Amino acid sequence: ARSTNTFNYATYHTLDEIYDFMDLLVAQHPELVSKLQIGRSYEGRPIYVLKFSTGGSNRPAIWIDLGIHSREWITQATGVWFAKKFTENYGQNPSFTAILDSMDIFLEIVTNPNGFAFTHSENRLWRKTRSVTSSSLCVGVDANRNWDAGFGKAGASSSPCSETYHGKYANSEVEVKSIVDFVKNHGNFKAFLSIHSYSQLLLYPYGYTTQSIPDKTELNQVAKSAVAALKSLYGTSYKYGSIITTIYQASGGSIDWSYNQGIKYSFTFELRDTGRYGFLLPASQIIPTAQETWLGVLTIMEHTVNN
Numbered sequence: 001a002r003s004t005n006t007f008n009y010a011t012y013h014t015l016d017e018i019y020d021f022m023d024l025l026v027a028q029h030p031e032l033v034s035k036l037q038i039g040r041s042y043e044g045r046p047i048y049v050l051k052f053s054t055g056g057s058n059r060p061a062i063w064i065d066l067g068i069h070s071r072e073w074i075t076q077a078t079g080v081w082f083a084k085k086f087t088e089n090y091g092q093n094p095s096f097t098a099i100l101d102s103m104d105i106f107l108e109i110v111t112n113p114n115g116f117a118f119t120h121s122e123n124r125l126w127r128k129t130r131s132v133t134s135s136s137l138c139v140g141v142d143a144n145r146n147w148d149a150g151f152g153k154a155g156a157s158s159s160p161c162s163e164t165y166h167g168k169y170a171n172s173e174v175e176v177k178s179i180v181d182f183v184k185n186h187g188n189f190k191a192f193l194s195i196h197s198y199s200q201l202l203l204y205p206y207g208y209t210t211q212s213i214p215d216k217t218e219l220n221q222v223a224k225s226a227v228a229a230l231k232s233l234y235g236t237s238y239k240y241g242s243i244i245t246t247i248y249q250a251s252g253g254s255i256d257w258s259y260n261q262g263i264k265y266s267f268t269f270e271l272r273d274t275g276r277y278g279f280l281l282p283a284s285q286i287i288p289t290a291q292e293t294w295l296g297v298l299t300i301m302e303h304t305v306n307n
């Protein structure tokens with residue numbers, strides 16, 4: 001509570017505790033991390049992004065977002081751990097140090113604030129945002145079906161009450177448009193990673209079309225390598241491939257959008273587990289999950305800095 005060194009990484013936290021955590025981290029490592037507000041959620045909560053940088057002018061960057069689907073608590077928890085990990089490994093780990101000396105990292109721990117708060121107060125399994133639709137009593141949009149990539153096509157629902165409702169139009173959700181604007185304004189992102197749970201998968205584009213991306217071979221080899229590194233810690237087995245061939249057809253997904261923007265290294269991680277606990281993964285698995293997931297993300301970052 002007092003410093004990031006006394007913060008309990010082995011338990012799930014509320015929105016306010018995570019937000020306070022951000023201010024403690026920035027105050028402890030002002031020369032490495034800064035807090036940016038890229039917008040406000042539907043219910044007015046600020047949307048924060050942590051920027052890790054050793055300097056430079058608009059250096060190529062890595063984007064990482066967690067919790068777009070609020071009920072996937074393991075993601076926001078892994079995000080908090082990542083933030084701390086960055087500050088601890090810079091100057092200690094040769095590989096990660098090399099990356100931060102040439103690239104910036106943007107981390108969005110709570111991509112869907114309103115949904116997260118709701119999972120703490122009313123429905124632990126809430127998935128969508130909390131926006132209100134005109135002609136319906138149902139609330140929320142699936143933020144991972146709201147991006148401008150095959151928007152409205154098969155793999156999403158036009159029903160406001162559906163768990164996979166895509167919304168009135170692409171980027172209708174302020175939580176999504178805030179990211180879209182920031183990334184387009186930045187113009188120099190080289191990697192885009194969106195974290196989810198569960199089922200243990202590493203996926204690349206596309207989800208809305210059966211068409212194969214032109215960088216299929218390279219991304220597949222990168223995924224294979226990332227999966228091998230992640231498995232080395234506790235033996236956690238991951239499967240990998242394109243969204244549509246590995247899990248199911250899904251339209252309006254974020255990495256399909258990022259890839260079509262020219263960001264070649266676009267991947268989505270579906271963390272632990274495989275169904276035993278699902279979204280209600282025990283707090284005792286937070287650290288081990290984050291630790292192994294780190295090796296997988298580091299692997300992708302390494303390939304990016306050199307390519």
Ligand SMILES: NS(=O)(=O)N[C@@H](Cc1ccccc1)C(=O)O
Binds near residue numbers: 144198
């Ligand atoms: N967390 S999940 O169980 O919702 N699965 C994800 C899979 C997914 C990930 C990235 C783009 C399209 C689809 C989903 O948004 O449906």
Ligand SMILES: [Zn+2]
Binds near residue numbers: 069072196
């Ligand atoms: Zn999800």
